[PDB]
């Protein structure tokens, strides 16, 4: 198994579930904790459970385990992690508050 | 089941497969022999009487326990042995097996089994009431004369006696304790050693008693 052969599938169920600015970052020459990140955001409190409840299955297709869904019920910022891919499900505006992309502005990024 | 006797030697550690540390004691177990198989028709219980360490033979001006005596010597050679120092009976073990005069090898213990250990404690002399039973000590400033002492003992002119199961000073130490459900790590055969995960009672050079667990 390998990561780069597993991120075109990672952008899959989040454009299926109609994610927006669904970009992806890498951390090869950055960090030693996780390879690549994926990012998104969503509008409605209803709309934020289905984006990531899907990812539960899609990790069971390759049969990699999931360990936590933080703020899932609260439905504000949610994080399913895999040590190679991460699904940061955001809100319409909290994306701007934390502003992920510019902390790691020095990130080779790719749009999808 | 199965049971072997031996001496506690020391304590060290080993590295597992995942580099994890596992702490271990080191049990030596040589020269065990069976000396009397039992019966229900005679005693009322089946068992296996076993003896562990060798000693010397009868002597005329004999003034130790190194050199054996005649009643002992008349019990070793019966089952074709030498005089044995320590003796114990094991009662929870199958008796159709274990013929007489043989030896008992550590090899009957695999690595990864489960056991329970039984031995003596260490000696503390005449000790108080808060090292022993472990209970609160009193103030040391603000004008106080109660520091390390057992406060009260009774109530009043009702129940003017003092009940029996009461906590006072005295002696704690060489009592019989057991430990349940430890693990077998590794089993040498030449040096005749068995290793156990965890620490077990007694002092060094003491005596240890090993047996299979009964629980699930």
């Amino acid at each position: 198994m390998n990561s780069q052969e597993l991120l075109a599938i990672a952008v899959d169920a989040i454009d299926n579930k109609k994610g927006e600015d669904t970009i992806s970052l890498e951390m090869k020459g950055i960090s030693d904790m996780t390879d690549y990140f994926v990012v998104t955001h969503g509008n409605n409190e209803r709309q934020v459970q289905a984006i990531a409840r899907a990812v539960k299955e899609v990790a069971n297709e390759q049969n990699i385990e999931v360990k936590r869904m933080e703020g899932y019920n609260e439905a504000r910022w949610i994080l399913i992690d895999l040590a190679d891919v991460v699904v940061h499900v955001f809100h319409k505006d909290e994306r701007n508050y934390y502003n992920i992309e510019k902390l790691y502005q020095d990130a080779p990024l790719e749009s999808y | 089941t199965k049971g072997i006797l031996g001496r506690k030697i020391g304590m060290t550690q080993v590295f597992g497969e995942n580099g994890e540390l596992i702490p271990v004691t080191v049990v030596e177990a040589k020269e065990n022999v069976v000396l009397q198989k039992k019966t229900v028709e005679v005693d009322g219980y089946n068992a296996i009487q076993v003896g562990f360490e060798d000693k010397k033979a009868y002597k005329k001006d004999a003034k130790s326990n190194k050199y054996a005596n005649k009643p002992a010597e008349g019990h070793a050679k019966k089952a074709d042995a030498a005089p044995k120092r320590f003796i114990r009976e094991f009662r929870n073990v199958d008796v159709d097996a274990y013929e007489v005069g043989q030896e008992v090898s550590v090899d009957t213990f695999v690595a990864g089994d489960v056991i329970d250990v039984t031995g003596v404690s260490k000696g503390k002399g005449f000790q108080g009431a808060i090292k022993r039973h472990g209970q609160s000590r009193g103030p040391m400033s603000h004008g106080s004369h109660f520091h390390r002492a057992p406060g009260s003992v009774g109530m009043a002119s009702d129940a003017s006696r003092v009940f029996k199961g009461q906590k006072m000073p005295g002696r704690m130490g060489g009592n019989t304790v057991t430990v349940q459900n430890l693990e077998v790590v590794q089993v040498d055969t030449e040096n005749k050693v068995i290793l156990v995960k965890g620490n077990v009672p007694g002092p060094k050079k003491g005596l240890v008693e090993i047996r299979t667990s009964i629980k699930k």
Partner: protein, 122 residues
């Protein structure tokens, strides 16, 4: 270790700088807390201009200690000060940007949002 009437510090961009511990969230008469532990605090010193003023009770999380943690591989890690980070109802941080390292034990502690943001994990 972190117990009642203990003064940690703060390592986030949320105004509160120093705090005072007054509880630990176990419950059977618990009397300490190490890394990975949700607690209750107040503030005793802030910065002018921010989002968490002085006199506000809040819950908070450890990230560093003088006493370390006993890794199962037979390894130990002890820092040279203490530190804390302030959180919210949604199990996530008040501010945004983390300062100073943290400890890897926070990955299996559902604090992945904070390793998601911090310079040096170690």
């Amino acid at each position: 270790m972190i117990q009642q009437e203990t003064r940690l510090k703060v390592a986030d961009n949320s105004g509160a700088r120093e705090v005072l511990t007054i509880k630990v969230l176990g419950g059977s008469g618990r009397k300490t807390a190490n890394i990975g532990d949700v607690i209750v605090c107040t503030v005793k010193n802030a910065t002018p201009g921010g989002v968490v003023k002085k006199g506000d009770v809040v819950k908070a999380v450890i990230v560093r200690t003088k006493s370390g943690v006993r890794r199962n591989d037979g390894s130990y890690i002890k820092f040279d000060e203490n530190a804390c980070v302030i959180i919210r109802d949604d199990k996530g941080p008040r501010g945004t940007r983390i300062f100073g390292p943290v400890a890897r034990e926070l990955r299996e502690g559902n604090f992945m949002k904070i390793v998601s943001l911090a310079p040096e994990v170690l």
